[PDB]
Structure formats: C-alpha cells, structure tokens
Design a protein around this motif. Sequence first.
Motif, PDB file in Angstrom:
ATOM      1  N   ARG A  29       3.455 -32.179  -9.058  1.00  0.00           N
ATOM      2  CA  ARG A  29       4.595 -33.072  -9.059  1.00  0.00           C
ATOM      3  C   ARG A  29       4.195 -34.514  -9.345  1.00  0.00           C
ATOM      4  O   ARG A  29       4.900 -35.228 -10.059  1.00  0.00           O
ATOM      5  CB  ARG A  29       5.354 -33.039  -7.751  1.00  0.00           C
ATOM      6  CG  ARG A  29       6.657 -33.771  -7.900  1.00  0.00           C
ATOM      7  CD  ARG A  29       7.540 -33.673  -6.697  1.00  0.00           C
ATOM      8  NE  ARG A  29       8.912 -33.870  -7.117  1.00  0.00           N
ATOM      9  CZ  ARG A  29       9.777 -34.691  -6.549  1.00  0.00           C
ATOM     10  NH1 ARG A  29       9.411 -35.418  -5.494  1.00  0.00           N
ATOM     11  NH2 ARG A  29      11.017 -34.753  -7.021  1.00  0.00           N
ATOM     12  N   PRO A  62       0.739 -27.890  -5.331  1.00  0.00           N
ATOM     13  CA  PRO A  62       2.063 -28.249  -5.834  1.00  0.00           C
ATOM     14  C   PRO A  62       2.340 -29.760  -5.862  1.00  0.00           C
ATOM     15  O   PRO A  62       2.896 -30.261  -6.864  1.00  0.00           O
ATOM     16  CB  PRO A  62       3.015 -27.500  -4.890  1.00  0.00           C
ATOM     17  CG  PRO A  62       2.216 -26.247  -4.530  1.00  0.00           C
ATOM     18  CD  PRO A  62       0.803 -26.816  -4.318  1.00  0.00           C
ATOM     19  N   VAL A  63       1.966 -30.491  -4.811  1.00  0.00           N
ATOM     20  CA  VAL A  63       2.254 -31.938  -4.790  1.00  0.00           C
ATOM     21  C   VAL A  63       1.448 -32.665  -5.910  1.00  0.00           C
ATOM     22  O   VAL A  63       1.944 -33.639  -6.471  1.00  0.00           O
ATOM     23  CB  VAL A  63       2.086 -32.588  -3.409  1.00  0.00           C
ATOM     24  CG1 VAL A  63       0.621 -32.729  -3.018  1.00  0.00           C
ATOM     25  CG2 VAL A  63       2.814 -33.912  -3.362  1.00  0.00           C
ATOM     26  N   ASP A 119       0.878 -28.858   4.486  1.00  0.00           N
ATOM     27  CA  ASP A 119       2.214 -28.305   4.279  1.00  0.00           C
ATOM     28  C   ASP A 119       2.285 -26.817   4.622  1.00  0.00           C
ATOM     29  O   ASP A 119       2.709 -25.996   3.811  1.00  0.00           O
ATOM     30  CB  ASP A 119       2.685 -28.600   2.850  1.00  0.00           C
ATOM     31  CG  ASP A 119       4.199 -28.709   2.722  1.00  0.00           C
ATOM     32  OD1 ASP A 119       4.946 -28.656   3.718  1.00  0.00           O
ATOM     33  OD2 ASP A 119       4.684 -28.869   1.587  1.00  0.00           O
ATOM     34  N   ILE A 140       0.266 -24.324   2.319  1.00  0.00           N
ATOM     35  CA  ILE A 140       0.511 -24.309   0.899  1.00  0.00           C
ATOM     36  C   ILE A 140      -0.644 -24.973   0.179  1.00  0.00           C
ATOM     37  O   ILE A 140      -0.982 -24.597  -0.890  1.00  0.00           O
ATOM     38  CB  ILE A 140       1.816 -25.025   0.564  1.00  0.00           C
ATOM     39  CG1 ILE A 140       2.996 -24.205   1.043  1.00  0.00           C
ATOM     40  CG2 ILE A 140       1.980 -25.198  -0.927  1.00  0.00           C
ATOM     41  CD1 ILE A 140       4.284 -24.957   1.006  1.00  0.00           C
ATOM     42  N   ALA A 185       6.682 -20.759   0.208  1.00  0.00           N
ATOM     43  CA  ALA A 185       5.319 -21.294   0.366  1.00  0.00           C
ATOM     44  C   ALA A 185       4.414 -20.822  -0.710  1.00  0.00           C
ATOM     45  O   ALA A 185       3.239 -20.587  -0.459  1.00  0.00           O
ATOM     46  CB  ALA A 185       4.751 -20.941   1.755  1.00  0.00           C
ATOM     47  N   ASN A 240       1.889 -20.849  -3.736  1.00  0.00           N
ATOM     48  CA  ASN A 240       0.848 -21.676  -4.378  1.00  0.00           C
ATOM     49  C   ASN A 240       0.032 -20.942  -5.452  1.00  0.00           C
ATOM     50  O   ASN A 240      -1.125 -21.272  -5.727  1.00  0.00           O
ATOM     51  CB  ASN A 240      -0.094 -22.275  -3.329  1.00  0.00           C
ATOM     52  CG  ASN A 240      -0.745 -21.229  -2.480  1.00  0.00           C
ATOM     53  OD1 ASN A 240      -0.663 -20.030  -2.776  1.00  0.00           O
ATOM     54  ND2 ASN A 240      -1.335 -21.664  -1.405  1.00  0.00           N
ATOM     55  N   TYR A 261      -2.515 -28.580  -1.421  1.00  0.00           N
ATOM     56  CA  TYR A 261      -2.109 -29.758  -2.179  1.00  0.00           C
ATOM     57  C   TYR A 261      -1.796 -29.474  -3.627  1.00  0.00           C
ATOM     58  O   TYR A 261      -1.426 -30.388  -4.362  1.00  0.00           O
ATOM     59  CB  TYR A 261      -3.210 -30.838  -2.114  1.00  0.00           C
ATOM     60  CG  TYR A 261      -3.249 -31.639  -0.812  1.00  0.00           C
ATOM     61  CD1 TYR A 261      -2.519 -32.786  -0.663  1.00  0.00           C
ATOM     62  CD2 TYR A 261      -4.043 -31.226   0.262  1.00  0.00           C
ATOM     63  CE1 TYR A 261      -2.566 -33.526   0.512  1.00  0.00           C
ATOM     64  CE2 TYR A 261      -4.116 -31.949   1.434  1.00  0.00           C
ATOM     65  CZ  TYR A 261      -3.379 -33.111   1.555  1.00  0.00           C
ATOM     66  OH  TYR A 261      -3.427 -33.840   2.717  1.00  0.00           O
ATOM     67  N   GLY A 298       5.468 -24.558  -4.442  1.00  0.00           N
ATOM     68  CA  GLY A 298       5.813 -25.463  -3.384  1.00  0.00           C
ATOM     69  C   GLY A 298       7.249 -25.362  -2.970  1.00  0.00           C
ATOM     70  O   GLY A 298       7.871 -24.304  -3.106  1.00  0.00           O
ATOM     71  N   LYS A 299       7.773 -26.461  -2.462  1.00  0.00           N
ATOM     72  CA  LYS A 299       9.086 -26.416  -1.832  1.00  0.00           C
ATOM     73  C   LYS A 299       9.710 -27.787  -1.818  1.00  0.00           C
ATOM     74  O   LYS A 299       9.051 -28.803  -2.081  1.00  0.00           O
ATOM     75  CB  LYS A 299       8.948 -25.831  -0.406  1.00  0.00           C
ATOM     76  CG  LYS A 299       8.148 -26.694   0.575  1.00  0.00           C
ATOM     77  CD  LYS A 299       7.926 -26.068   1.969  1.00  0.00           C
ATOM     78  CE  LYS A 299       9.162 -26.009   2.890  1.00  0.00           C
ATOM     79  NZ  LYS A 299       9.861 -27.310   3.276  1.00  0.00           N
TER      80      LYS A 299
END
Length: 289
Positions: free
Chosen positions: A45, A41-42, A34, A37, A189, A191, A39, A175-176
């Motif tokens: 989530r 943030p994902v 991403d 950025i 962006a 992190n 991993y 993240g975004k």
Amino acid sequence: LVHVASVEKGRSYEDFQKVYNAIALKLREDDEYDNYIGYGPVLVRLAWHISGTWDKHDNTGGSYGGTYRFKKEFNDPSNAGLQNGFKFLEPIHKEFPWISSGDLFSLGGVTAVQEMQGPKIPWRCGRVDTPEDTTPDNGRLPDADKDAGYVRTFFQRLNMNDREVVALMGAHALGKTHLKNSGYEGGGANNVFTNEFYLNLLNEDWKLEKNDANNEQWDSKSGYMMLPTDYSLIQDPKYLSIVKEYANDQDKFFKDFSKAFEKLLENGITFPKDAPSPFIFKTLEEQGL
Ligand code: HEM
Ligand SMILES: Nc1ncnc2ccccc12
C-alpha cells in the motif's frame, strides 16, 4: 517538468539485491504485526500511495521525489496507517543510507509482492529525492465510497486503462481495512498473493451493511468484505469481463499485475537511454536464505 533517473553513484544490481534481502529478512522476522499478517500488505500500500499522487497532465507527484518523508504528505488522511510501513523501513534506510527515498519505498513494494509468492516485478533504480516544496497537496488519492465511473475517471489521471485498473485492484486480496485508519473494517488476514480477490467477488453472497463508522460496505457470511469501489468492478460490464478473466487464469493475472505495478511505480520518470535495464530480484527462497 522532467524527472530524470540518476543511478545512485557506483551502485549496481548486487547493491540493490542486498537491500531487497534486508527488507525480505525483516518481513520474515517481524511476523506478529497486525495479528500475524506481517508487514507485506502495508508495504504494498505504501508503494502504491507514494506513486498514486502522480498527475499525467503536469508530471507532478509520483514516486520519483520520495516526498512521503515530508510532513504534508506523511500526514495526508488518505495515508493513515502507512506510518507503520515507514517505521519498518527506517532501520533499512540507516543500514543503506545511499538509497534514495523513492527507490526505497518502491523497492519495499516489489519485495513484499515477491516475498508473498506473487509475480516477479522488474524494478528500475534512480529516483532522486526532491525538496519539500515539490510535495503534492493532499487529496490526490482515491475515495472508497464511490462507483465504477469514479474509479475509471480517477485512474485516467494515472494513465491506467480498464485492464490495468482491474489488475491493480487484485492487490486487495492482501491485508485488510482498519476502522481507525479508513472507516472500513475487515477483510481477514491474507498475506499470500493470489487471484482470490476476483474469486471472492464472483462467488460470495454480498450484503450491503453499515459499519461502526457509519459507512456502507459489502460483507459476506464467510467473513469477507468489499469496499464500494471493489464491488463496482462487478457492477460495470467492462470491468466484469476482466474480473472473470482473472478469476479463471491465475497466470494472466500475475503477468498483467506485474506490468501495471511496474508502470505505476515508474510513472513520471524519464530513463536515459543508457540507464541500466530493469532488475529482477531473486527471492530469499530462490537464494536458499
Ligand atoms: C480505487 C482505488 C483504491 C481505493 C479506494 C483503495 C482503498 C483502500 C482502503 C480504504 C484500504 C484500507 C486502509 C486501512 O484501513 O488500513 C486499502 C488497503 C489496501 N490497499 Fe487499497 N485502494 C485502492 C487501490 C489500491 C491499489 C491500486 C493497490 C495496490 C496495487 C492497493 C493496495 C492496498 C493494500 C495492499 C491494502 C492493505 C493494507 C493493510 O493491510 O494494511 N489499493 N485500500
Ligand atoms: N482483504 C480485502 N478484501 C477486499 N477488499 C479490500 C480492500 C482493501 C484492503 C483489503 C481488502
């Protein structure tokens, strides 16, 4: 409906620290995802979405059963994009096949927050994988195009109060949004876990614009964005007070986030009185790794 935590057989702190370390090392190594950025943030989530299906009324959903691994939940439109997080964790699960799916998905979130220089999040083991028929139906996760009353009412189902909600939402510093996932675009962006979500809400000059998916969002000339549900936190007088509190006290925000995030990840789980105490994992940096 009771879900009793059961420790993976013979496992202790050191086993789970090994898993933490494996996730943390891969987060450092697979750094281009991403647009650099990473991993982190994902993974945050993912831990939230597996937990956020819970319903306090009947104790269905939540992190315990690891049900995201089944098609119905994996394919929920609300979970679009989280497949990337699942793929990230898959080799970890192969290396440590004894860990339950709920434990892995929740630990991924804890690891991410800490490795992004966030607060320590105590974490408890013992989620147990449950069968496919225990997978909650789609539609339990929140919409983004709504207002403060919606957010308040939604989070009552998860037994979260106004301070807990405002604290949890501070994860949106990370993240975004991605147009193809959610029909919202942007956020930059970042992190590194900070209180900047609250500072941005208060300090930026927000403009209500329509994006390429025909959805409204709040944009600033600095290049930031807020979802309608993000912006609702400064439209409601009770939320606004708490936003101001966190904008002005980083430590308070860290402490309140830690508690709310642990609660979110533990909702629905009964821990026996002789269960181990929560673990606090050392970061790679604390280990000199
Ligand atoms: C009313 C509640 C919430 C709504 C409507 C909401 C909505 C969204 C949406 C639409 C995205 C963009 C997904 C994409 O396009 O890839 C997103 C991303 C994210 N959300 Fe939330 N969210 C909420 C609450 C939370 C909570 C409670 C947390 C964690 C504690 C969280 C953490 C994140 C993170 C870390 C991302 C970034 C993912 C990435 O960069 O890939 N969200 N959220
Ligand atoms: N970076 C973000 N800024 C504001 N709101 C958000 C909402 C979801 C994901 C990321 C962000």
